[PDB]
Amino acid sequence: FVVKDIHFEGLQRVAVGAALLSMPVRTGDTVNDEDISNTIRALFATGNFEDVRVLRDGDTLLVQVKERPTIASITFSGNKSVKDDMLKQNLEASGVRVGESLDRTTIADIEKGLEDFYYSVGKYSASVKAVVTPLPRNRVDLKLVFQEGVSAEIQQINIVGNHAFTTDELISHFQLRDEVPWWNVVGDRKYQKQKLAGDLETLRSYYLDRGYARFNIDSTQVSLTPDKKGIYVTVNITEGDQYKLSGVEVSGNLAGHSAEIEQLTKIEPGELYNGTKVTKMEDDIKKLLGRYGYAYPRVQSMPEINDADKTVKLRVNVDAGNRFYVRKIRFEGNDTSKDAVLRREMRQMEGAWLGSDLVDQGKERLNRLGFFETVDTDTQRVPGSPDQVDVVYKVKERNTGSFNFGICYGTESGVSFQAGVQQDNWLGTGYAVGINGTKNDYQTYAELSVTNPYFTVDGVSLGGRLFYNDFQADDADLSDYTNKSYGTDVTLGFPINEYNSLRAGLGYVHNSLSNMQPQVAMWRYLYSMGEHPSTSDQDNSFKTDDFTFNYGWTYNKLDRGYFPTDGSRVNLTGKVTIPGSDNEYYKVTLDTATYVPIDDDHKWVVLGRTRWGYGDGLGGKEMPFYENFYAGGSSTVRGFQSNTIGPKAVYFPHQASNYDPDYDYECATQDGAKDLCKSDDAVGGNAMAVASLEFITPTPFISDKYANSVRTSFFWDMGTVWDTNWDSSQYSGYPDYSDPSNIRMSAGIALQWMSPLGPLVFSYAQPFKKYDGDKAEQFQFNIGK
Amino acid sequence: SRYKRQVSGDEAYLEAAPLAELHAPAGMILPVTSGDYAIPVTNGSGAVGKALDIRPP
Amino acid sequence: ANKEATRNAAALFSVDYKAFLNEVNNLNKRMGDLRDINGEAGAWARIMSGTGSASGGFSDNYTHVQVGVDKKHELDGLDLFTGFTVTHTDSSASADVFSGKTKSVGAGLYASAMFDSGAYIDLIGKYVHHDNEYTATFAGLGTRDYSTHSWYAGAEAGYRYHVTEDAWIEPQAELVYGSVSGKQFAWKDQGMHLSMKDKDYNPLIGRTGVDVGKSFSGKDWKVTARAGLGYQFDLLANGETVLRDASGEKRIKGEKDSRMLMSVGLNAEIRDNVRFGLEFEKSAFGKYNVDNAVCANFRYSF
Amino acid sequence: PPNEIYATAQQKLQDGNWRQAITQLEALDNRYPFGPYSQQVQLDLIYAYYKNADLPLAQAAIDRFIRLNPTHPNIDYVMYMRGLTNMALDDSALQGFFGVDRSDRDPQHARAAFSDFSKLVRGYPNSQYTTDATKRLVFLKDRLAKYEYSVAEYYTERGAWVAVVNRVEGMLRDYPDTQATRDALPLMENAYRQMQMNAQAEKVAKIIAANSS
Amino acid sequence: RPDINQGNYLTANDVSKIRVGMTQQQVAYALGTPLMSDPFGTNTWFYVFRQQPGHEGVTQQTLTLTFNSSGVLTNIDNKPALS
Amino acid sequence: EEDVVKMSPLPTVENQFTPTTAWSTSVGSGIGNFYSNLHPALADNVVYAADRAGLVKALNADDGKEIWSVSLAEKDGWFSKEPALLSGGVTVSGGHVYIGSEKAQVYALNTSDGTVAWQTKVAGEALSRPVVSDGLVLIHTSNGQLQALNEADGAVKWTVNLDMPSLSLRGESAPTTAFGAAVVGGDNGRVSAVLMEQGQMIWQQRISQATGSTEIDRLSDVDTTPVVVNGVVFALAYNGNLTALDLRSGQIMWKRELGSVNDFIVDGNRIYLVDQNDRVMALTIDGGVTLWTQSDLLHRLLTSPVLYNGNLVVGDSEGYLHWINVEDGRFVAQQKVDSSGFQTEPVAADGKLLIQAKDGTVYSITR
């Protein structure tokens, strides 16, 4: 009868408080039936309700409202490149989603709120007409009409008030630019507030490093064209006087280290003011204090300006706090990884003064182990004392390492099994286990490699590999032979410096050479060995047990993985067969890759590569023909088929070559040429020399964002391979070639392109100097480099 | 590990090591024991052995 | 003139047509994968290997590597995928008497339009450059530079009918029109001599298939299964060869091959980073058949 | 009917396997997360998860149950089950993997298990699970002392003598009764002997001579 | 090779501030809280300063400060002798 | 990308007086798509025209012949030859031709042979016409600063600050002299009434629409010349409203909800104007009730309507000039004279109609 309270129902996005104002009836009113029909009509006519039920339940109006139809479908009609999916998800994230009632007043509110939002973020997209289309049964269709005007592009970026620099110098280092990238320049035509703030911060940092300590940005106006397609950015900047540094005064608590702090400051008079030089001096003082255990210093530099003498001087307030001492180093989140694996990579020692640089070096060492997704560090000041720290390393375990089992079955191919187990942290220890296996009708490989880094706490690596290779003499003989080689290598490596590593080890190798073709270079070795193979007959069985002392060296300093730009990597691998083996020989291999940048942007890089190899026997023995060097192909001397640079086989008259498609087969298999024949197939040489010179450009036409994944290069390659034990003699086949002097020279273009299949490399090569017998390969595809 | 009446992992209510205090030699004392890893004395019903009645109440 | 020399000359002209069929079969798998993913964006790379056999002791193997860039675009009521692909093919083929080794560099532009109505059109244009070095019983065919150029456009029109929330039927028709430069050979030897010449020929291949996809999503074991039954038939077939030699004049008929293709794909992800893949492709009833390329790969992260 | 679903969940849980019983219990839980008759279903779900190797799901169900019922007669079972799920997470040689010894690996789970078993024994010493909880507390104290010994052995091998004596001093303060503290007393004597203090090495030698094993 | 640092950092100017009959709180303010202490009976603080730069010899300074039970320093023992 | 565009080329044609395309002359290389208020302004039948890059060319009104021609490389480094980027419109008086620029320089150039009489640096970039009245050239800059310059030296100077939003609209309202007071618009949707020779008389009036935030001002920027007639000023914000304001109180406004971003012409009763949605209309001086509307050219970016021989002349962005009848609002004629389009104010004066295209081509059109 008289209204005491008025209630409303289910107003999730709808407003309960507004509904009482939108109802003409208030609390403290008196209602008749006529009024209840009038309130039901007014509440339906607000635009926010579909069913209105008003109950006079005693003296309290129970108003049960059913809202407007729920969102059912949203229709997408975006064209023009608008990325419509982003716009709909942005409307859903900034407002209504599924299960949110959608009203009929919100047709104007969505058009208005989208218009405000576009003006607020600067760049104007055409407004979406989010018309609410009524449907029966409490459902609604949201028909979004898209005008589709898009990507208001930067038109001009104006610097106003500059009188000592060109506009293009300042535009060049901005994130936002009007320029169109071809292969050197960069620029974003999209408008973004964060990129404009970055561009203003780079503009101040530039003017501060050019000697202006009074540089002020008076205003930054971003204006929109009436067509809504152009964005204008103007910056009103005021320059100051040129200031030269006269002297730096350091004051505060320097903890007695003034004779070291004051020698990293006091720039000599005649140097212009630079802000990044002040930041670098502050960070060098903070690092020098950190070296003495001060891990919480307060270094504050403020400039004293002189407008009379036109100079800037620096006051550096250095407050070195207490020394912090590490009490516990905690590793947390390592369920499978042993603590010794994480703790041995520490360069911060427990029970020692805290070095923040040492903690970050430990964190970088845990990250470059590769066993953890994310590695963090928490400098927890231990409760209860000023000078004590617990360094807690949060890690996340990876399922790194996998078992790949492949099986195939063909009609020319039987069951081709492949198996690969790569396990880093085997049994959760620091051991790395690599197992490889391949079964095929022409190939059987197996390898078990067990490596222990940190065998000794200094960081030495003890590895052991057990290998078994078995290759059959396939039809169409190409000097091929039934090889079965198996053995075990034990290798102890030790770092003699943070860039230099030395390696030593022993290897037992067995070889079984069977079904070998009568040919001069192989038999020159076999004759050096006690065996004199039967001259016509292919039937052979050469079995050697070889005990080799292996040694090596690595100098590795390269600025980045995959696409190094600076530094040098020098690898040396050699072996000497020790007394007690069947055959005795020595090999030396030297790989050098040096990347020299000729630019501060690190894109114009000169790469010099050198691969040299040499090897002879000991006493009257020769180097084994199965351990010779090969060149050509994509890694070395590109533009020739893989393994075709060097000495070629000189074949004796054979009896069996299996079946070669060619009627001639190898030299005089069945009847054929009585004289010794010249192969065009490389048999390998005792020595090799390869020199590559590469020029490196930014991608010739690639999105700079992808330029790190794509290395575009051009290249000039040179390679020679020669025998050292070749005695000159008159043959009817291959000419006497012991000369390193013949060199094969090629030039071309090389592409390196990262892919989800690993580093994929494509190259086009033109061999402009080659010899007879050598094959040519114009296109190269490979993995790695 | 085991998904029967025995442990989902491994036995720790059977497998264990006896704990024995260290004696204090004359002229000195052991470090003061202020750890929160103190083991209270047991006086309840024994449930050790093959039997492990862990059915949900 | 020799029987081998004639077989080697016929094999050298047939190697092109086999490489063209192998590259078209490898290329269709990208469009298949791109449609089954329902669109992707950015850089992609794929690797494929296959083996084919034909009567007369002909066996060929091919490794194909594809790199490309793809871009998704929303326009009208369709999803538009537009991309550029660079392909490298390394192929070895032996006729019992004649064996060749072919390197192929292909550049292609592809566009797939997927309509919301339940249909799709795929258009690809491809230019392939082929360098071949080969082995020959006599020096007349010799070992030497063999360069060819192939231009082909593939157009596939198909429909996507979802018969369940996780099960689909795709009826598709693919037409590939190719153009290969005319060729002819005369023997280099002065003791033996013969000449084989073939008419210029444009191989046009029509394929009709019905692919069937089924999913079995267990509790965590997502299983995706697909199966396809297609028919590949010559509509414009291989050129006919004319041989003239000291044994006179003869005509050898070009290849007219028709084959049934069975394709099965399984992807079972039992858990995160624990997956089993299987591919099966088999052709039959042609003089040249794509033989059993069945492979399985199990990858278990510890 | 929900009574039919609870009876089929109990028959699958007792006669069958926990995997077939989790889905049947989840069918009750989905209708009633906060719904009535959802409290015994949560305890059945906690046992089914524990026995199904679903340790994070079992701990999340225990946390839901101890918030929904702060006081209940079977709260001793809920406290035993949290230490038991943490003890099954330690020994993470589960789900197809094993490790030779896991003392070295993160002790956080072992510390949480020790805290929950201790809080049960000091709160409810009259429960049927008190003796097993005390035996698990002895094993967990041996595991924590073996972890601090493994850290002391590394620091001895690296040459961190101040870290070794600070670790063995922490072990004597926290784990005086464990075998690993006896194993660690040699390391503390060696670490002092490598420094210029022999009086501390004589004191550790007197501790070892009084009793070590 | 890694540098091994252990103990507190001792300076020749702050060890001179330490005198007999000094409160242990003043010693802890002057040199920081000791990392190594005597946990057996007598309160004795060991300020060790040990540096091993990988290859070079061990630099060991041992400052033994014996504190009286009341908390006043009774016996400075400074050994700059290397280990 | 692609847009709805919303623009329909108008097919109907009645060129009873076929427009003579005459006296053409390419000035500079073009203003391009860059927004500019450059326009060919004539006094004495001498057209002074200007393009971006400092290119001032005086011209003949009866021909394409040039009475004077010049180029500017001054205060940006003489050796550099840096682009002045002229973007204020030529305004001519006193023997001095005033042109503003986006290098913050107002370059008064003498009528006789382009003597640079005074390059005065002003605070901010000049993007307004330099309306000269009372012996003061008044320039509104994009920094939101109204700058006064004396006709002889640019030494007479006073700065008035007008409110600037974070996202303004490009274009700066024209200072219109009324009672020796410039009734300037502004980018905060405020019709200021700054007196000349003073920084005062500013009856700050809010005419901006109130919907949204930055839809109050960045949607609605007054960038149209406040037209004074009968002692009443008229101003339009972009989505905001035509708001008649008196010049004796300034705080009383009556409006219809109509916005524009291009200039408009008041001939007594009718405020012929073009809406920011590209619609031509004639409104009553009292109220703003639509007398007629020509809505045929939606979204074509038309230019300021000019009255020529009783016809309303507008230019679209596709290079079509469209004569419209002012009695009923129907087209009398249409003709394309350019293919680069128009986005610049046309001038109708001395019996000549001139338009400068985006390529800098000046077209003179006779009805």
The DSSP code sequence of A127-180 is PEEEEEEEETTTEEEEEEEE------EEEEEEEES--SS-HHHHHHT-SB-S--
Cβ contacts of E39 on chain B, cutoff 8 Å? 31-32
Cβ–Cβ contact F111 with A under 8 A: no
Query: Does F have 3 or more CB contacts under 8 Å with B?
Result: no
User: Which of D158, D162, D169 is nearest residue E7 as measured by Cβ atoms?
Assistant: D162
Three-class SS of residue B31?
Answer: coil
Query: Does E have 3 or more CB contacts under 8 Å with C?
Result: no
State which residue of chain D sits closest to B49, comparing Cα positions. D132
- F34 close to F21: Cβ distance less than 8 angstroms: no
* Alpha helices, H only, F257-355: none
- H or E element that contains D42: helix D39-51
State which residue of chain E sits closest to D199, comparing Cα positions. E38
State which residue of chain A sits closest to E30, comparing Cα positions. A322
How much of chain E is in helix, strand and coil states, percent to nearest 5? 15, 40, 45
In whole angstroms, give the CA distance from residue F111 to residue F94. Answer: 9
* Alpha helices, H only, chain C: 3-36
User: How do the domains of chain C map onto residue ranges?
Assistant: 1-302
- B30 close to D210: Cβ distance less than 8 angstroms: no
- H or E element that contains A447: strand A443-453
CA distance A426 to chain E (A): 26
- H or E element that contains A22: helix A16-22
Cβ distance of C95 and A406 shorter than 8 Å: no
Cα separation values, D210 from C119, D166, D185, D206, E41, Å = 88, 22, 12, 6, 16
Touching subunits for chain B (3+ Cβ pairs under 8 A): D, E
Nearest CA to D86 out of B8, A114, A453, A109 is that of B8
The Cβ of residue F272 has, within 10 Å, a number of other Cβ atoms equal to: 23
User: Which of F35, F167, F213 is nearest residue A122 as measured by Cβ atoms?
Assistant: F167
Beta strands in A496-566 (DSSP E): 500-514, 541-558
Rounded to 10 degrees, what is the CA torsion of D24, D25, D28, D32? Answer: -150
Angle, to 10 degrees, between the axis of helix D39-51 and the axis of helix D75-89?
20
* Alpha helices, H only, D159-198: 161-174, 179-194
Structure tokens at F191: 């019709």
Nearest CA to F357 out of F299, F306, F316, F322 is that of F316
The dihedral region occupied by F26, where left means phi > 0, alpha psi between -120 and 50, and beta the remainder, is beta
Resolution number, Å: 3.5
Nearest CA to F127 out of F96, F99, F95, F157 is that of F99
In whole angstroms, give the CA distance from residue F250 to residue F256. Answer: 17
- H or E element that contains A51: strand A49-57
The Cβ of residue A770 has, within 10 Å, a number of other Cβ atoms equal to: 18
Cβ distance of D93 and B1 shorter than 8 Å: yes
In whole angstroms, give the CA distance from residue A585 to residue F293. Answer: 101
- A591 close to A604: Cβ distance less than 8 angstroms: no
State which residue of chain B sits closest to E42, comparing Cα positions. B28
- A3 close to A29: Cβ distance less than 8 angstroms: yes
Residue owning tokens 């501390």: D200
State which residue of chain A sits closest to D91, comparing Cα positions. A335
Q: How many residues does chain B have?
A: 57
Q: How much is the CA Rg of chain F, to the nearest whole Å?
A: 20
Compute the Cα dihedral for B5, B9, B13, B14 and give only its sign.
positive
Cβ distance of C44 and A410 shorter than 8 Å: no
In whole angstroms, give the CA distance from residue C152 to residue D108. Answer: 64
- Cα C264 from chain centroid (whole Å): 17
Bridge partners for A648 per DSSP: A682
Cβ–Cβ contact E6 with D under 8 A: yes
The Cβ of residue C267 has, within 10 Å, a number of other Cβ atoms equal to: 16
In whole angstroms, give the CA distance from residue A35 to residue A6. Answer: 14
**Any idea which architecture A402-783 has in CATH?**
Beta Barrel (2.40)
Q: What is the DSSP string of A4-18?
A: S-EEE---SSS-HHH
Three-class SS of residue F190?
Answer: strand
Cα separation values, A240 from A163, A197, A215, A313, Å = 11, 22, 6, 16
Rounded to 10 degrees, what is the CA torsion of A79, A80, A85, A89? Answer: -100
Backbone angles phi, psi at D58, to 5 degrees: -60, -45
Cβ distance of A224 and F301 shorter than 8 Å: no
Q: For residue D6, what are the contacts with CB-CB under 8 A and spacing of at least 6?
A: D28, D41
Structure tokens at B22: 């260290």
Count CA within 13 A, CB hemisphere, residue A283. Answer: 7
Cα separation values, A319 from A255, A389, A440, Å = 9, 20, 71
Cβ distance of A349 and D163 shorter than 8 Å: yes
User: Which of B9, B52, B53 is nearest residue D88 as measured by Cβ atoms?
Assistant: B9
User: Which of C86, C293, C298 is nearest residue A405 as measured by Cβ atoms?
Assistant: C298
State which residue of chain F sits closest to A154, comparing Cα positions. F34
Cβ distance of E41 and B29 shorter than 8 Å: yes
Three-class SS of residue B35?
Answer: coil
In whole angstroms, give the CA distance from residue D150 to residue D144. Answer: 10
In whole angstroms, give the CA distance from residue A213 to residue A246. Answer: 14
In whole angstroms, give the CA distance from residue C272 to residue F157. Answer: 74
State which residue of chain F sits closest to A149, comparing Cα positions. F3
Of chain B, the end-to-end C-alpha distance in Å amounts to: 24
The Cβ of residue C201 has, within 10 Å, a number of other Cβ atoms equal to: 21
In whole angstroms, give the CA distance from residue C28 to residue C261. Answer: 13
- A171 close to A157: Cβ distance less than 8 angstroms: yes
Q: What's the one-letter identity of residue B41?
A: V
How many structural domains is chain E composed of?
1
Cβ–Cβ contact F148 with A under 8 A: no
CA angle A390, A392, A397 (to 5 degrees): 165
Nearest CA to D184 out of D149, D151, D213, D159 is that of D149
CA distance E37 to chain D (A): 9
- H or E element that contains F43: strand F41-43
The Cβ of residue C146 has, within 10 Å, a number of other Cβ atoms equal to: 17
Nearest CA to C240 out of C250, C248, C231 is that of C250
* 3-state helix/strand/coil string of A463-497: EEEEEEEEECCCCCCCCCCEEEEEEEEEEEEEECC
In whole angstroms, give the CA distance from residue D84 to residue C143. Answer: 76
User: Which of A402, A411, A680 is nearest residue C300 as measured by Cβ atoms?
Assistant: A402
Q: Domain containing E11: what range?
A: 5-83
In whole angstroms, give the CA distance from residue A483 to residue A282. Answer: 65
- H or E element that contains C123: strand C119-135
Bridge partners for A235 per DSSP: A159, A220
Q: Domain containing F161: what range?
A: 1-367
Residue C118 burial by CB count (10 A; 0-12/13-18/19+): exposed, middle or buried? exposed
Query: Does E have 3 or more CB contacts under 8 Å with D?
Result: yes
- F186 close to F218: Cβ distance less than 8 angstroms: no
Cβ contacts of E32 on chain A, cutoff 8 Å? 322-323, 325, 386-387
In whole angstroms, give the CA distance from residue F94 to residue F103. Answer: 24
Query: Does A have 3 or more CB contacts under 8 Å with E?
Result: yes
In whole angstroms, give the CA distance from residue A512 to residue F102. Answer: 85
CA angle A132, A133, A138 (to 5 degrees): 100
Cβ distance of A256 and E11 shorter than 8 Å: yes
In whole angstroms, give the CA distance from residue A773 to residue C136. Answer: 16
CA angle A120, A126, A127 (to 5 degrees): 75
In whole angstroms, give the CA distance from residue A708 to residue A685. Answer: 38
Q: What number of C-beta contacts closer than 8 Å exist between D and E?
A: 40
User: Which of D131, D207, D210 is nearest residue B44 as measured by Cβ atoms?
Assistant: D131
Nearest CA to A778 out of D193, C225, C131 is that of C131
Structure tokens at D158: 């690296």
Q: What number of C-beta contacts closer than 8 Å exist between A and D?
A: 55
Residue owning tokens 């916005």: F259
- Cα A398 from chain centroid (whole Å): 18
- H or E element that contains A20: helix A16-22
Nearest CA to F349 out of F91, F134, F106 is that of F91
Structure tokens at C82: 């537009």
Structure tokens at A774: 């050598």
Nearest CA to A525 out of A472, A576, A583, A474 is that of A583
CA distance E15 to chain A (A): 14
Q: For residue F261, what are the contacts with CB-CB under 8 A and spacing of at least 6?
A: A226, F169, F171, F221, F223, F224, F236, F238, F276
- Cα F57 from chain centroid (whole Å): 19
CA distance A189 to chain D (A): 48
- Cα F147 from chain centroid (whole Å): 18
Structure tokens at F137: 């050239």
Bridge partners for F190 per DSSP: F206
In whole angstroms, give the CA distance from residue A582 to residue C14. Answer: 51
Rounded to 10 degrees, what is the CA torsion of A468, A474, A478, A481? Answer: 40
Backbone angles phi, psi at F365, to 5 degrees: -120, 125
Cβ contacts of E42 on chain B, cutoff 8 Å? 28
- A316 close to A250: Cβ distance less than 8 angstroms: yes
Cβ–Cβ contact E69 with B under 8 A: no
Backbone angles phi, psi at F305, to 5 degrees: -60, 135
Q: What's the one-letter identity of residue C253?
A: K
The Cβ of residue D164 has, within 10 Å, a number of other Cβ atoms equal to: 28
- Cα F197 from chain centroid (whole Å): 24
Q: For residue F292, what are the contacts with CB-CB under 8 A and spacing of at least 6?
A: F281, F282, F328, F329
- H or E element that contains D5: helix D2-14
State which residue of chain E sits closest to B27, comparing Cα positions. E41
Compute the Cα dihedral for D188, D190, D196, D199 and give only its sign.
positive
- A189 close to A175: Cβ distance less than 8 angstroms: no
Q: What's the one-letter identity of residue C66?
A: Q
Structure tokens at C123: 């258009």
CA distance F187 to chain A (A): 10
Q: How much is the CA Rg of chain C, to the nearest whole Å?
A: 22
CA distance D186 to chain E (A): 16
Q: Domain containing D196: what range?
A: 1-213
How many structural domains is chain F composed of?
1
In whole angstroms, give the CA distance from residue F236 to residue F305. Answer: 15
Of chain D residues 138-157, which have a CB less than 8 A from chain A?
Answer: 147, 150-151, 154-155, 157
The Cβ of residue D198 has, within 10 Å, a number of other Cβ atoms equal to: 11
In whole angstroms, give the CA distance from residue A437 to residue A444. Answer: 8
In the DSSP assignment, the letter for residue F122 is -
The Cβ of residue D95 has, within 10 Å, a number of other Cβ atoms equal to: 9
In whole angstroms, give the CA distance from residue A114 to residue A94. Answer: 10
Backbone angles phi, psi at A487, to 5 degrees: 175, -175
Nearest CA to C134 out of C103, C105, C106 is that of C103
In whole angstroms, give the CA distance from residue A123 to residue F167. Answer: 9
Cβ contacts of E34 on chain D, cutoff 8 Å? none
Cβ–Cβ contact D160 with E under 8 A: yes
Nearest CA to A683 out of A611, A619, A737 is that of A737
* Alpha helices, H only, chain F: none
What determination technique applies here?
A: cryo-EM
Query: Does B have 3 or more CB contacts under 8 Å with A?
Result: no
In the DSSP assignment, the letter for residue C239 is P
Residue owning tokens 């995160």: C272
- H or E element that contains D79: helix D75-89
In the DSSP assignment, the letter for residue F242 is -
State which residue of chain D sits closest to E7, comparing Cα positions. D162
In whole angstroms, give the CA distance from residue D181 to residue A673. Answer: 85
Structure tokens at D189: 């004597």
User: Which of A256, A353, A459 is nearest residue E5 as measured by Cβ atoms?
Assistant: A353
In whole angstroms, give the CA distance from residue C93 to residue C74. Answer: 44
In the DSSP assignment, the letter for residue A208 is H
Interface test with D, best of B2, B5, B10 (most D CBs within 10 A): B10
Interface test with D, best of E50, E55, E58, E77 (most D CBs within 10 A): E50
CA distance A123 to chain F (A): 9
